Design a protein around this ligand. Structure first.
Ligand SMILES: *[C@@H]1O[C@H](CO[C@@H]2O[C@@H](C)[C@@H](O)[C@@H](O)[C@@H]2O)[C@@H](O[C@@H]2O[C@H](CO)[C@@H](O[C@H]3O[C@H](CO)[C@@H](O)[C@H](O)[C@@H]3O)[C@H](O)[C@H]2NC(C)=O)[C@H](O)[C@H]1NC(C)=O
Ligand SMILES: *[C@@H]1O[C@H](CO[C@@H]2O[C@@H](C)[C@@H](O)[C@@H](O)[C@@H]2O)[C@@H](O[C@@H]2O[C@H](CO)[C@@H](O[C@H]3O[C@H](CO)[C@@H](O)[C@H](O)[C@@H]3O)[C@H](O)[C@H]2NC(C)=O)[C@H](O)[C@H]1NC(C)=O
Ligand SMILES: *[C@@H]1O[C@H](CO[C@@H]2O[C@@H](C)[C@@H](O)[C@@H](O)[C@@H]2O)[C@@H](O[C@@H]2O[C@H](CO)[C@@H](O[C@H]3O[C@H](CO)[C@@H](O)[C@H](O)[C@@H]3O)[C@H](O)[C@H]2NC(C)=O)[C@H](O)[C@H]1NC(C)=O
Ligand SMILES: *[C@@H]1O[C@H](CO)[C@@H](O[C@@H]2O[C@H](CO)[C@@H](O)[C@H](O)[C@H]2NC(C)=O)[C@H](O)[C@H]1NC(C)=O
Ligand SMILES: *[C@@H]1O[C@H](CO)[C@@H](O[C@@H]2O[C@H](CO)[C@@H](O)[C@H](O)[C@H]2NC(C)=O)[C@H](O)[C@H]1NC(C)=O
Ligand SMILES: *[C@@H]1O[C@H](CO)[C@@H](O[C@@H]2O[C@H](CO)[C@@H](O)[C@H](O)[C@H]2NC(C)=O)[C@H](O)[C@H]1NC(C)=O
Ligand code: NAG
Ligand code: NAG
Ligand code: NAG
Ligand code: NAG
Ligand code: NAG
Ligand code: NAG
Lengths: 529, 529, 529
């Protein structure tokens, strides 16, 4: 869209010669939208003379002169603008390394010998080391049959749990028990061969590039009106972005400036301060990657049932010998990954996997240019770039292509396309997949809107689509759909509208979806009454 | 405010017929402010002919023809714009269910029998179940008199604490103690009848609707100058918003586009990733609702003194029998709610209640259109919407109403209006309540500014107010006021200015407030010296 | 940059007299950039008459009249705009007080007497109090030689750790051990004399002030063209900002409006909800200040190895007597500060110190106007302010100064300038320090860009610099530089470009830097195999 278009006398005072150079320019301010991938509209700046060196018309030299390229002839300077896919890239800062799944190994020594002392040189589990220095509390812990447990197991069965499932019965091995050598167990902390590096994510940065194609005419162009045959011209592509928000033509006929983007209506996911878990090595494979909130972790390794739970946490756990094997070792990377695989299967969105933003596919993040240790997300909310073009021309006009369209498909699917037709209310979300077609002979821009929805359907923001002539396109990633009630519904409705480049509806369709009632965490029953 | 206003030749190349249709349009870009609730200003687009089908003037048909509605007559196309209240709505995703207040029930069996075994079929507290399966560690724990405690209580008094306050004295019941049946206690975990559903909040989305009222003239209008009598016209309201950022007139004389909003000077509260606690059922009542940081919770129920503390945390607590009743069960939803009620009474802002954003009132969130399971907040920071109007007219002019105003009241009050006159420095904030009056005969826009403040008073952002003719208005929600020093002050000052629609001060007033010194957490005294 | 420039008929309907006052104005919308500190460009509004009271030309009174100041003469109204340094200020809300370093004092009483009872009136460590009330669990804990430990230490050496390093050997003191008086120890929790106040940070607010200098002419001004000698004029400075986004001239020839800023390409650090640790007292000294994530803290004091770990956490720690002295007391403010000093020395960025945002210097935050209890950060991402000027003039022109420049230095340094030449890949970041010079006779604006970088170098956003004539300037704070691979590289490259005010490169330079391989946390080796 064109914000402003008009004439301005722009003067420049030279820094070294103090001389003032004034020239009237056509100043255009326009927006370069998020999904503006095709050259579907152009700005035609009218020039009163061609091949002007200084940009000033009329010609100061004679056409009879072979060294005078300037011709007092009219032709338009055609300027089109596109934007590359927009990404929110988060800088990584390495914190620590985390094991996939620390595992407890239980030893039941035949000789009934168990050594877990802090000053023990030869313990049952052995010691761990770090650069030749012995790691504190890495020797594990020992457990033995309680005198009460031996009594209960001999004359019946002990109701108290033993971590290693020891048989405390006197008759299980009476010779050793009699002389004090009661059944014993060793509890060693071992690590999975797979380790993960943890990187804290910084603040998002919008990353894109705007390409301005400038067709500079060298000669003029050779009841229903049609577009004039193109003038012999010289193409030139200029690039703008947050890194380089400035650019000028070689002729310096055109000068562009990236002012900045307007604010996004839907904020970016709050993932700064989270810890990105990347697999340690034995194109970038972000499939196994996870992004975890700091509450899910134990940085110092001193806390149980957390990502990073270490030797001290495991060794000194309250009533450790009376707990079940692998207690203290829940909520590890392997557990969380598996809990998420379970969630996807239940039509729910993962909490830890990095695909919880894309909507299922790992393939969408792959198209990102960043290095092996980079993380970014596709931006779907509109982020309108204000660009200001300053041209040495008489005037300007806007020439927009308007091809009609048709919605060829629309469905509400679950995460990772588990099933289409609807999703679980409030405990899950749906994904609006839409297939559209350009039914014209020209590349054109379109707007997909979801509105006039049934009760308690969260508003969905619109989507921009640049579709090639006669070609088919789809929304990637799809639109997120949430309901604001926990009830089961057979046919919740929404109108899916397809607007052309001029703001007229070319196609409309009613999208129907079901919701399954929210499956709340089931309350425990019983206890003291 | 009007950013740009000028003429642009806009051409459209038809997608199927390839024919070019050019027409010069008046292009206006303007801002639609946050508190723009009334039609206080209009854009008058001058038309050289009325009832034109194609929007093109002059008339291509004869006035003598009954099927020709077009008249070569002048009249303005009046266009006014308003914005509905702006909301930041956060999508809910169900995580788990949390009890209001888990309660410990202490049993002191007469028969001195206590069973807390892991494999015990009939324990003292009984078992809890989930879908017929027995819940692990839900049988509670048992405590008994230490042999040392029986000795101390017999020959004096035990200085060691017992959880159930057992009388370990031999003479309390000598017959049972003699035969080994020492006093015993059972500690059962029970749950309050009230449960709460926990929903993780997603990213904010700005939600509003812009209404453009278009008065299309059908006939012309029938030293101090006055406004011309209105021309016989046909009203039409068009709507723009993040969902539908496009709109055109039925006549397609006017075409609107929502470009997006500028960034807000004061960021939205960082409440994404927090867990919204909604009461489980036995208009939407968000009064009892709470919003909690993940650090306040124990999702897996394995950690003590957290929202979600469960059976394992309670059963295996270090020196559990030597702690006070209800240990491990602090910091529950009931405790936090009560700690917040306490805070409000002390002139402090709640940390967990969802009213900690509004400034006291539960009534402000009630005016939100969302479903029973929706959460949103009123936006008070300016969020300026850029709208671009493209009209088939000769020119345009802006007609703004300028009614004078007066500040009829201004006070600094505490949270939930506890008391007015001031607040506690740094540990609390104040709320600037302002009452203004339109002292003119026309609906008008105003700006309330708080500036020229005394030392260490945090800058307050301005506020837009559209007030009806002769009517009274107030700031809702009020302005937040913070000080940057911890000292007690009798009369800290600020200038409250009321600007008219033209940028001239109609009323000014000096607002005075006190601050009570920051009441810091009192340090413990004593211990080893 | 100038967005729009054109004429608009602006009408005002008086609220009390209902009379319409129309006047055609020149409406200019422009951007006021982040580093726009100097008056390097001006807008010249052409006036057809001078000293007009109503702003309307031509003169309604005779020049022959002594009480008629109006002269039908031409002169420009010169308007320049600057912006003060931009800050993101976070409101403080006091939560609690935290000790610098709680310390454990170990007592080994000669008389072998240790009292740690909950109902004990005279315990070994003594009690702590709060307003005369005894603080629960503040009496510490007692430890004694295990009967097994006495046996092992007598007939060899005990392999089990004792917290106070007790000699459990019978022969160490046989008289007392024989009669049951085994070696005992007391473990008292003491506090460092230094305490810190913890303040929760609220949401960021952009804070700046735009100064518009208006030179109102009173009389007219007295082949290579030069700038006309200045017209006798009267200077006037107007101020805009989030608090007061409105302003008008005394002549009301000029009327300004702050529309708002465009969104920043690089989001502000996610520091809301974090706890700012300010030293308690015995210009503002923010050197010792720290900003901590809530996961680093124990608000209720019930959890070990956290900022806020208190008496209960310390008293009831699992196997407390078998742990090393000061266990439970790790991760305190003193520890974190020291771990950060260690990080800076290793070329790494601190995690807790508030200098982790500036890039090393404490001096950058000092230039902030806020009170003793205020926190703010310098904004380096562009934040473009849209300003709309509405002037009673015939037309306008833009006069920009263009002085050439040169890059006099460029280096990649570590945090706090540890060493220049490069940094540690992914585990650290580099800081691009750039020194530029204005080689002209006029104050001018410039753009520093970092682009055409070697593989896996994170894109750096551009930087605006207003440099005085003939003067030297540098980027403060410096540019952050991250790599997207963990490899060691000798010469990673980037082009540092210096653009003049017109968008032409005046100087270019290639910046070379090394990266040291990411030093990952070393995995423990050993344990059970
Ligand atoms: C989520 O809900 C879907 C639909 O919602 C509910 O539909 C009814 C079952 C009814 O209870 C209504 O009030 C709800 O709104 C569930 O999908 C339905 O699944 C049915 C069983 O699989 C299916 O049925 C018939 O299926 C075929 C014909 O299609 C027959 O061969 C068969 O014998 C059944 O009669 C029904 O058509 C289907 N409905 C839709 C709209 O797809 C869905 O299973 C549920 N999800 C989960 C995981 O529970
Ligand atoms: C917060 O501070 C308020 C005012 O600040 C302080 O005012 C003085 C007490 C003095 O110490 C000064 O240096 C401070 O700035 C407190 O309000 C004050 O409360 C007083 C006692 O209630 C009150 O007094 C008189 O009140 C009436 C007359 O108004 C008499 O009948 C009575 O006998 C007292 O003489 C005083 O007027 C009032 N001041 C104001 C400005 O309202 C406020 O209590 C305090 N809040 C808390 C919770 O401590
Ligand atoms: C981070 O890396 C810097 C450079 O990277 C590496 O340089 C080589 C050592 C080589 O391994 C290459 O593949 C890497 O890219 C380290 O800086 C280097 O440090 C060397 C030893 O201090 C130094 O060498 C010579 O230094 C002087 C001459 O300058 C001689 O007197 C001396 O005898 C050595 O021969 C080398 O020049 C220097 N390189 C650069 C580019 O500065 C840096 O130490 C390292 N940082 C850490 C903390 O490990
Ligand atoms: C959008 O169009 C694609 C086809 O271009 C649809 O995908 C096909 O779906 C059928 C039936 O499930 C499969 O047999 C094909 O293998 C699919 N092709 C591809 C390339 O995936 C898709 O379902 C359409 N989406 C909507 C919402 O209508
Ligand atoms: C703004 O005006 C309202 C009245 O319209 C004031 O509220 C009244 O205050 C008096 C005195 O406390 C009460 O008796 C009334 O019941 C209140 N009315 C309502 C509707 O609340 C209010 O105090 C004024 N605010 C300021 C800051 O001056
Ligand atoms: C930018 O210029 C300053 C000088 O104005 C440089 O700083 C000096 O560096 C030398 C050598 O290290 C020291 O002897 C001086 O004491 C420094 N002066 C000051 C004021 O710090 C600085 O190194 C230059 N930076 C770059 C990147 O070239
Ligand atoms: C990514 O990594 C996993 C690791 O198990 C592997 O199975 C997969 O094939 C890899 N490649 C892709 C493209 O997913
Ligand atoms: C209202 O919604 C229904 C579908 O629910 C649709 O048929 C209709 O066209 C919509 N009307 C408007 C005015 O949006
Ligand atoms: C909201 O819920 C509470 C629950 O106790 C009830 O007391 C109250 O009356 C309800 N209604 C309103 C409007 O607050
Ligand atoms: C300065 O502040 C005082 C009130 O503290 C006010 O009376 C005065 O009008 C203000 N002046 C300006 C120029 O803002
Ligand atoms: C700030 O505080 C520290 C406290 O130890 C002190 O050493 C320092 O000199 C103070 N001043 C400055 C300007 O750093
Ligand atoms: C490409 O980068 C190199 C430095 O790496 C530089 O010399 C060259 O000028 C750059 N070219 C462009 C077109 O940016």
């Amino acid at each position: 869209e064109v914000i402003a278009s008009g004439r301005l006398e722009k003067c420049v005072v030279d820094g070294v010669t103090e001389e003032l150079d004034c020239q009237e320019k056509v100043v255009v301010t326009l927006t370069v939208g998020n999904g503006q991938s095709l050259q579907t509209e152009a700005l035609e700046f009218s020039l009163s003379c061609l091949n002007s060196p200084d940009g000033r018309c009329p010609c100061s030299c004679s056409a009879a002169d072979p060294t005078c390229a300037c011709r007092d002839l009219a032709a338009p300077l055609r300027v089109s603008l596109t934007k590359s896919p927009l990404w929110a890239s988060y800088p990584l800062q390495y914190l620590s390394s985390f094991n996939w799944k620390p595992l407890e190994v239980i030893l039941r020594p035949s000789n009934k010998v168990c050594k877990d002392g802090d000053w023990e040189d030869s313990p049952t589990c052995g010691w761990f080391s770090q650069g030749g220095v012995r790691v504190a509390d890495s020797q594990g812990f020992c457990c033995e049959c309680s005198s009460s447990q031996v009594w209960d197991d001999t004359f019946g069965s002990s109701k108290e749990r033993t971590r290693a499932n020891l048989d405390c019965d006197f008759w299980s091995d009476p010779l050793d028990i009699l002389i004090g050598r009661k059944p014993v167990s060793a509890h060693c902390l071992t690590f999975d061969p797979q380790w993960y590096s943890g990187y804290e994510l910084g603040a998002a940065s919008l990353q894109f590039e705007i390409a301005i194609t400038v067709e500079v005419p060298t000669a003029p162009s050779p009841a229903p009106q049609f577009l004039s045959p193109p003038a012999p011209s010289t193409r030139e592509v200029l690039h703008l972005g947050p890194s380089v928000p400035l650019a000028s033509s070689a002729s310096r006929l055109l000068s562009a400036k990236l002012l900045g983007d307007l604010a996004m209506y839907t904020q970016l996911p709050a993932i700064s301060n989270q810890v990105l878990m990347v697999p340690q090595p034995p194109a970038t494979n972000r499939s196994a990657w996870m992004l975890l909130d700091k509450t899910m972790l134990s940085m110092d390794g001193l806390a149980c049932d957390k990502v990073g739970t270490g030797f001290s946490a495991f060794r000194y756990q309250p009533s450790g010998c009376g707990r079940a094997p692998q207690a203290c070792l829940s909520g590890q990377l392997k557990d969380l990954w598996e809990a998420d695989l379970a969630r996807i299967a239940d039509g729910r969105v993962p909490l830890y996997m990095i695909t919880r933003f894309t909507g299922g596919s790992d393939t969408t993040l792959q198209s990102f240019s960043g290095g092996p240790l980079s993380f970014a997300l596709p931006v779907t909310s509109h982020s309108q770039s204000l660009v200001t073009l300053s041209v040495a021309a008489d005037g300007v006009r806007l020439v927009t292509n308007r091809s009609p369209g048709k919605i060829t498909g629309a469905a509400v699917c679950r995460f990772a396309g588990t099933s289409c037709g609807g999703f679980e209310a409030v405990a899950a979300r749906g994904y609006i997949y839409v297939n559209i077609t350009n039914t014209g002979r020209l590349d054109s821009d379109y707007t997909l809107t979801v509105s006039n929805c049934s009760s308690n359907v969260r508003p969905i923001e619109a989507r921009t689509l640049a579709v090639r002539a006669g070609s088919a396109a789809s929304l990637d990633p799809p639109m997120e759909l949430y309901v604001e009630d926990q009830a089961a519904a057979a046919a919740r409705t929404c109108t899916v509208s397809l607007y052309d480049s001029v703001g007229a509806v070319t196609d409309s369709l009613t999208l129907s979806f079901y919701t399954n009632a929210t499956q709340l965490v089931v309350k425990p029953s019983g206890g003291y009454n």
